[PDB]
Design a protein around this ligand. Structure first.
Ligand SMILES: [Ca+2]
Lengths: 6, 279
């Protein structure tokens, strides 16, 4: 359910 | 115009060959264009932004950048010293918390926000959005980015840092947005950069110097760094009237430096973004 910095 | 002793990535997107240190660009410098940075926020007070930055939306108790990721990305788009489009207007949208993480529902809410907010801003030359974030594949996330693009905002998204095919990541895998991989200072695909047929273009991604929180600087690496190089370029090329928000990704890819990269697997474009300036 989560996105993150790249 | 010419900026001597510039960060290597700015010089590269104004060079047909590697190993140069000057940034050549038209003095219009993206004036009259607006770039939304959707991330951990923007430390607007930073001297390098010269008052052109401001925070317009947060989904957390605070609108400040406590992480630094978004401030660096915004610096690469439009900071006075480290930025591609030195006269653009930047708008921050804090969709990630200061740990760098966020929920997909809040990511989607931020994209639909920009599609509406741009109609309340003076961007007579065009609107770009930079999305240096991602996660596992989700149709809903992809749909949100596609909606944002269709509304008339050039959407640039980082391909991902898992040295894998970007088709299994979102919003990178959305065909209608511009999907940006990373290269290093010796014209090699960065070791960590995702790849695949869904990639549109490469930009400088390794060891990128830009703004940070606390009024400072630092160098860091990732597809998050290449994406604002492409975001700022689009703002610069729209001010010049060379393309439109709808057709900009295709225009950058067609005008790119083609055939200079190594470590590019079969099935991925060998295109490095180039600003085509001839003084
Ligand atoms: Ca595309």
């Amino acid at each position: 359910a989560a996105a993150s910095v790249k | 115009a010419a900026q001597t002793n510039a960060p290597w990535g700015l010089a590269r997107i104004s060079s047909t060959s590697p190993g140069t240190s000057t940034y050549y660009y038209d003095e219009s410098a993206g004036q009259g264009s607006c770039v939304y940075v959707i991330d951990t926020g923007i430390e607007a007070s930073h001297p390098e932004f010269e008052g052109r930055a401001q925070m317009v939306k947060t989904y957390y108790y605070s609108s400040r950048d406590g992480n630094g990721h978004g401030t660096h990305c915004a610096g690469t788009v439009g900071s006075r010293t480290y930025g591609v489009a030195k006269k653009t207007q930047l708008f921050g949208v804090k969709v990630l918390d200061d740990n760098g993480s966020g929920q997909y529902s809040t990511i989607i809410a931020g994209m639909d926000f920009v599609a509406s907010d741009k109609n309340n801003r003076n961007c007579p030359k065009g609107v770009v959005a930079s999305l240096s974030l991602g996660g596992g594949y989700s149709s809903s996330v992809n749909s949100a980015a596609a909606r944002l693009q269709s509304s008339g905002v050039m959407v640039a998204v980082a391909a991902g840092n898992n040295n894998a095919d970007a088709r299994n990541y979102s919003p990178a895998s959305e065909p209608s947005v511009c999907t940006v991989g990373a290269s290093d200072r010796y014209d090699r695909r960065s070791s960590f950069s995702n790849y695949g047929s869904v990639l549109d273009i490469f930009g400088p991604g390794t060891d990128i110097l830009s703004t940070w929180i606390g009024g400072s600087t630092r160098s860091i690496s990732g597809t998050s760094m290449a994406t604002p190089h492409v975001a700022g370029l689009a703002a610069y090329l729209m001010t010049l009237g060379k393309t439109t928000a709808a057709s900009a990704c295709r225009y950058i890819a067609d005008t790119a430096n083609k055939g200079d990269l190594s470590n590019i697997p079969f099935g991925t474009v060998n295109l490095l973004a180039y600003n085509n300036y001839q003084a």
